Design a protein around this motif. Structure first.
Motif, PDB file in Angstrom:
ATOM      1  N   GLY A  22       0.827  -1.190   0.000  1.00 10.95           N
ATOM      2  CA  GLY A  22       0.000   0.000   0.000  1.00 10.95           C
ATOM      3  C   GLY A  22       0.864   1.243   0.000  1.00 10.95           C
ATOM      4  N   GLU A  23       0.265   2.382   0.329  1.00 12.70           N
ATOM      5  CA  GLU A  23       1.002   3.637   0.362  1.00 12.70           C
ATOM      6  C   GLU A  23       0.280   4.679   1.211  1.00 12.70           C
ATOM      7  OE1 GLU A  23       0.440   4.300  -3.783  1.00 12.70           O
ATOM      8  OE2 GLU A  23      -0.026   6.432  -3.519  1.00 12.70           O
ATOM      9  N   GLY A  24       1.033   5.659   1.696  1.00 11.80           N
ATOM     10  CA  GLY A  24       0.467   6.725   2.499  1.00 11.80           C
ATOM     11  C   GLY A  24       0.638   8.080   1.843  1.00 11.80           C
ATOM     12  N   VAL A  30       6.426  -1.856   0.217  1.00  8.12           N
ATOM     13  CA  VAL A  30       6.535  -3.050  -0.606  1.00  8.12           C
ATOM     14  C   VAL A  30       7.015  -4.226   0.236  1.00  8.12           C
ATOM     15  CG1 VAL A  30       7.641  -4.105  -2.611  1.00  8.12           C
ATOM     16  CG2 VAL A  30       7.039  -1.677  -2.660  1.00  8.12           C
ATOM     17  N   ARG A  31       6.324  -5.356   0.129  1.00  9.76           N
ATOM     18  CA  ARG A  31       6.786  -6.583   0.760  1.00  9.76           C
ATOM     19  C   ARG A  31       8.015  -7.089   0.022  1.00  9.76           C
ATOM     20  NH1 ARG A  31       2.198 -10.629   1.450  1.00  9.76           N
ATOM     21  NH2 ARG A  31       2.261 -10.559  -0.844  1.00  9.76           N
ATOM     22  N   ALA A  32       8.989  -7.604   0.760  1.00  5.00           N
ATOM     23  CA  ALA A  32      10.215  -8.082   0.137  1.00  5.00           C
ATOM     24  C   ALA A  32      10.810  -9.272   0.876  1.00  5.00           C
ATOM     25  CB  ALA A  32      11.232  -6.958   0.054  1.00  5.00           C
ATOM     26  N   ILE A  97      13.720  -0.512   5.947  1.00 12.92           N
ATOM     27  CA  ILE A  97      13.274  -1.887   6.140  1.00 12.92           C
ATOM     28  C   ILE A  97      12.755  -2.117   7.554  1.00 12.92           C
ATOM     29  CG2 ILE A  97      13.869  -4.305   5.793  1.00 12.92           C
ATOM     30  CD1 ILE A  97      16.445  -3.252   4.371  1.00 12.92           C
ATOM     31  N   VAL A  98      11.468  -2.433   7.662  1.00 13.75           N
ATOM     32  CA  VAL A  98      10.839  -2.637   8.961  1.00 13.75           C
ATOM     33  C   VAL A  98      10.231  -4.030   9.072  1.00 13.75           C
ATOM     34  CG1 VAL A  98      10.319  -0.186   9.114  1.00 13.75           C
ATOM     35  CG2 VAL A  98       8.577  -1.777   8.269  1.00 13.75           C
ATOM     36  N   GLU A  99       9.750  -4.367  10.265  1.00 14.09           N
ATOM     37  CA  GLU A  99       9.176  -5.682  10.517  1.00 14.09           C
ATOM     38  C   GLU A  99       7.919  -5.928   9.690  1.00 14.09           C
ATOM     39  OE1 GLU A  99       8.743  -5.699  14.773  1.00 14.09           O
ATOM     40  OE2 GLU A  99      10.325  -7.210  14.985  1.00 14.09           O
ATOM     41  N   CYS A 100       7.613  -7.201   9.466  1.00 14.85           N
ATOM     42  CA  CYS A 100       6.486  -7.592   8.633  1.00 14.85           C
ATOM     43  C   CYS A 100       5.425  -8.344   9.436  1.00 14.85           C
ATOM     44  CB  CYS A 100       6.980  -8.454   7.472  1.00 14.85           C
ATOM     45  SG  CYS A 100       5.914  -8.451   6.027  1.00 14.85           S
ATOM     46  N   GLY A 104      -1.960  -8.393   8.323  1.00 11.31           N
ATOM     47  CA  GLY A 104      -2.478  -7.074   7.992  1.00 11.31           C
ATOM     48  C   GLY A 104      -2.873  -6.266   9.215  1.00 11.31           C
ATOM     49  N   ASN A 105      -3.627  -5.187   9.010  1.00  8.34           N
ATOM     50  CA  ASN A 105      -3.985  -4.308  10.122  1.00  8.34           C
ATOM     51  C   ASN A 105      -5.122  -4.871  10.971  1.00  8.34           C
ATOM     52  OD1 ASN A 105      -6.672  -3.339   9.211  1.00  8.34           O
ATOM     53  ND2 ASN A 105      -5.544  -2.222   7.625  1.00  8.34           N
ATOM     54  N   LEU A 106      -5.284  -4.314  12.167  1.00  6.58           N
ATOM     55  CA  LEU A 106      -6.238  -4.832  13.142  1.00  6.58           C
ATOM     56  C   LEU A 106      -7.694  -4.673  12.701  1.00  6.58           C
ATOM     57  CD1 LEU A 106      -6.778  -6.090  15.888  1.00  6.58           C
ATOM     58  CD2 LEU A 106      -6.641  -3.802  16.900  1.00  6.58           C
ATOM     59  N   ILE A 176       2.119  -1.765  16.692  1.00  9.04           N
ATOM     60  CA  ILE A 176       1.767  -0.408  16.297  1.00  9.04           C
ATOM     61  C   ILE A 176       2.663   0.075  15.161  1.00  9.04           C
ATOM     62  CG2 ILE A 176       1.479   1.964  17.072  1.00  9.04           C
ATOM     63  CD1 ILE A 176       1.276   0.735  19.950  1.00  9.04           C
ATOM     64  N   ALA A 177       2.046   0.602  14.109  1.00  5.31           N
ATOM     65  CA  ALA A 177       2.787   1.027  12.928  1.00  5.31           C
ATOM     66  C   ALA A 177       2.690   2.531  12.700  1.00  5.31           C
ATOM     67  CB  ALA A 177       2.291   0.282  11.704  1.00  5.31           C
ATOM     68  N   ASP A 178       3.659   3.064  11.958  1.00  5.61           N
ATOM     69  CA  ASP A 178       3.665   4.463  11.537  1.00  5.61           C
ATOM     70  C   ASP A 178       3.535   5.440  12.704  1.00  5.61           C
ATOM     71  OD1 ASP A 178       3.828   3.364   9.043  1.00  5.61           O
ATOM     72  OD2 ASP A 178       1.791   3.886   8.422  1.00  5.61           O
ATOM     73  N   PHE A 179       4.287   5.179  13.769  1.00  8.85           N
ATOM     74  CA  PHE A 179       4.309   6.022  14.986  1.00  8.85           C
ATOM     75  C   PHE A 179       5.244   7.218  14.794  1.00  8.85           C
ATOM     76  CE2 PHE A 179       6.756   2.080  15.517  1.00  8.85           C
ATOM     77  CZ  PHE A 179       8.041   2.528  15.655  1.00  8.85           C
TER      78      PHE A 179
HETATM   79  C1  90F Z   1       4.938  -8.184   4.753  1.00  9.45           C
HETATM   80  C2  90F Z   1       3.735  -9.086   5.045  1.00  9.45           C
HETATM   81  C3  90F Z   1       2.484  -8.367   4.557  1.00  9.45           C
HETATM   82  O1  90F Z   1       2.113  -8.532   3.395  1.00  9.45           O
HETATM   83  N1  90F Z   1       1.912  -7.581   5.496  1.00  9.45           N
HETATM   84  C4  90F Z   1       0.831  -6.823   5.262  1.00  9.45           C
HETATM   85  C5  90F Z   1      -0.025  -6.923   4.167  1.00  9.45           C
HETATM   86  C6  90F Z   1      -1.105  -6.055   4.040  1.00  9.45           C
HETATM   87  N2  90F Z   1      -1.926  -6.163   2.984  1.00  9.45           N
HETATM   88  C7  90F Z   1      -3.138  -5.318   2.923  1.00  9.45           C
HETATM   89  C8  90F Z   1      -4.316  -6.057   2.327  1.00  9.45           C
HETATM   90  C9  90F Z   1      -3.916  -6.684   1.011  1.00  9.45           C
HETATM   91  N3  90F Z   1      -5.091  -7.273   0.352  1.00  9.45           N
HETATM   92  C10 90F Z   1      -4.686  -7.900  -0.914  1.00  9.45           C
HETATM   93  C11 90F Z   1      -5.896  -8.487  -1.619  1.00  9.45           C
HETATM   94  O2  90F Z   1      -6.846  -7.440  -1.888  1.00  9.45           O
HETATM   95  C12 90F Z   1      -7.282  -6.814  -0.665  1.00  9.45           C
HETATM   96  C13 90F Z   1      -6.081  -6.225   0.061  1.00  9.45           C
HETATM   97  C14 90F Z   1      -2.855  -7.740   1.275  1.00  9.45           C
HETATM   98  C15 90F Z   1      -1.608  -7.102   1.877  1.00  9.45           C
HETATM   99  C16 90F Z   1      -1.336  -5.080   5.011  1.00  9.45           C
HETATM  100  C17 90F Z   1      -0.486  -4.968   6.108  1.00  9.45           C
HETATM  101  F1  90F Z   1      -0.700  -4.015   7.070  1.00  9.45           F
HETATM  102  C18 90F Z   1       0.596  -5.830   6.204  1.00  9.45           C
HETATM  103  N4  90F Z   1       1.399  -5.748   7.267  1.00  9.45           N
HETATM  104  C19 90F Z   1       2.486  -4.971   7.304  1.00  9.45           C
HETATM  105  N5  90F Z   1       3.610  -5.474   7.813  1.00  9.45           N
HETATM  106  N6  90F Z   1       4.465  -4.669   7.795  1.00  9.45           N
HETATM  107  C20 90F Z   1       4.015  -3.526   7.283  1.00  9.45           C
HETATM  108  C21 90F Z   1       4.636  -2.369   7.080  1.00  9.45           C
HETATM  109  C22 90F Z   1       3.950  -1.303   6.526  1.00  9.45           C
HETATM  110  C23 90F Z   1       2.618  -1.469   6.184  1.00  9.45           C
HETATM  111  O3  90F Z   1       1.983  -0.384   5.643  1.00  9.45           O
HETATM  112  C24 90F Z   1       0.802  -0.532   4.844  1.00  9.45           C
HETATM  113  C25 90F Z   1       0.665   0.709   3.951  1.00  9.45           C
HETATM  114  C26 90F Z   1      -0.378  -0.686   5.593  1.00  9.45           C
HETATM  115  C27 90F Z   1      -1.402  -1.416   4.994  1.00  9.45           C
HETATM  116 CL1  90F Z   1      -1.176  -2.081   3.418  1.00  9.45          CL
HETATM  117  C28 90F Z   1      -2.612  -1.622   5.644  1.00  9.45           C
HETATM  118  N7  90F Z   1      -2.813  -1.091   6.917  1.00  9.45           N
HETATM  119  C29 90F Z   1      -1.793  -0.355   7.522  1.00  9.45           C
HETATM  120  C30 90F Z   1      -0.583  -0.144   6.873  1.00  9.45           C
HETATM  121 CL2  90F Z   1       0.604   0.790   7.733  1.00  9.45          CL
HETATM  122  C31 90F Z   1       2.014  -2.708   6.422  1.00  9.45           C
HETATM  123  C32 90F Z   1       2.733  -3.704   6.962  1.00  9.45           C
END
Ligand code: 90F
Length: 300
Positions: A22-24, A30-32, A97-100, A104-106, A176-179
């Motif tokens: 995603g993006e802000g 980006v996942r990596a 590079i941060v934790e994964c 997803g979010n709560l 907690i993210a983006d603090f």
């Molecule tokens: C690295 C493992 C991973 O993929 N994690 C993940 C996927 C997601 N998504 C969002 C939904 C997305 N689906 C895909 C299918 O169509 C519906 C959306 C799948 C991936 C959201 C997350 F917060 C995360 N979790 C995050 N882990 N580490 C992060 C670092 C920054 C981060 O930021 C993104 C912009 C974000 C997102 Cl994408 C959603 N909510 C809060 C934030 Cl802060 C998310 C994660």
């Protein structure tokens, strides 16, 4: 081009960029795949989240990401926050590079795990039983409180604490993210709706919304809203109230009603977090201790 910090610097060639998450306002995530994040295991693969500038990047965007990077370095490591793992600043684009967190979010975690409604045919002995139970919900609230307590001790104010900014790991650990973000508090579009329909103004403390004042107690207000989100299983605060109405209601001292299937102990904490005077709201330390009592009482 940026100065080299050997403590945090990570070889960018040890990264394999994957799916964008995603993006802000500034920067994309980006996942990596990372190899040898732990230097004791150079060829070991791990999944990380890489923050980087967009192709829109002005220097203000670069400055914000650099600012976020330096915040990450100073806050330190805690179980209930998204921790810095490394950076890429040399001979290439800026990577943070941060934790994964795998789940997803709560907010989306809760919404996707709402119990089966009155329409499902009873198949098996647990047809009425959903994925979410009360003690786990309390645990989610407790962990966020612990994380916020840590951030407070590091003199860090989140300024947008919400369920969408709390991430869930594979083991259901709240992070907690983006603090550490520059969130442009002096030019907030209070009517601005996100792409997923969120109105961030509904998480703002009165002193923050009206007086542009941010303290740790303003985060406590937001935590109260987050509490409401949890026990509505990812519900949107102030249901059906547009921003214009929110303004006047807040001036009238209006508060959200007690959500269904929510014990008075937790709505009590919500209302305490929503006290007009910031000093009459509990501290995060008090929130941790209060939620701990509830958690232990339901953890036989
Ligand atoms: C690295 C493992 C991973 O993929 N994690 C993940 C996927 C997601 N998504 C969002 C939904 C997305 N689906 C895909 C299918 O169509 C519906 C959306 C799948 C991936 C959201 C997350 F917060 C995360 N979790 C995050 N882990 N580490 C992060 C670092 C920054 C981060 O930021 C993104 C912009 C974000 C997102 Cl994408 C959603 N909510 C809060 C934030 Cl802060 C998310 C994660």
């Amino acid at each position: 081009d940026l100065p080299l910090d050997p403590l945090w610097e990570f070889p960018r060639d040890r990264l394999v960029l994957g799916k964008p998450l995603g993006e802000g306002c500034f920067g994309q995530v980006v996942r990596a795949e990372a190899f040898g994040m732990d230097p004791a295991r150079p060829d070991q693969a791990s999944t990380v989240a890489v923050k980087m500038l967009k192709d829109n990047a002005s220097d203000k965007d670069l400055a914000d990401l650099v600012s976020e990077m330096e915040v990450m370095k100073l806050i330190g490591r805690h179980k209930n926050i998204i921790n810095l793992l490394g950076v890429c600043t040399q001979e290439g684009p800026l990577y943070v590079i941060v934790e994964c967190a795998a789940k997803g979010n709560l907010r989306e975690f809760l919404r996707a795990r709402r119990p089966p409604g009155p329409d499902l045919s009873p198949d098996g002995p647990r047809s009425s039983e959903g994925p979410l139970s009360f003690p786990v919900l309390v645990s989610c609230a407790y962990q966020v409180a612990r994380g916020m307590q840590y951030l407070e001790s590091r003199k860090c104010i989140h300024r947008d604490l919400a369920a969408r900014n709390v991430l869930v790991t594979e083991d259901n650990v709240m992070k907690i993210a983006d603090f550490g973000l520059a969130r442009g508090v002096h030019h907030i579009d209070y009517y601005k709706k996100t792409s997923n329909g969120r109105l961030p103004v509904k998480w703002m403390a009165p002193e923050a919304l009206f007086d542009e004042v941010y303290t740790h107690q303003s985060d406590v207000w937001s935590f109260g809203i987050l509490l409401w989100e949890i026990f509505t299983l990812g519900g949107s605060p102030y249901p059906g109230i547009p921003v214009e109405e929110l303004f006047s209601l807040l001036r009238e001292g209006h508060r959200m009603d007690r959500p269904p299937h929510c014990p008075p102990e937790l709505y009590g904490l919500m209302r305490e977090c929503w006290h007009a005077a910031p000093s009459q709201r509990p501290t995060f330390k008090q929130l941790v201790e209060a939620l701990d009592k509830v958690l232990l009482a339901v953890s036989e």
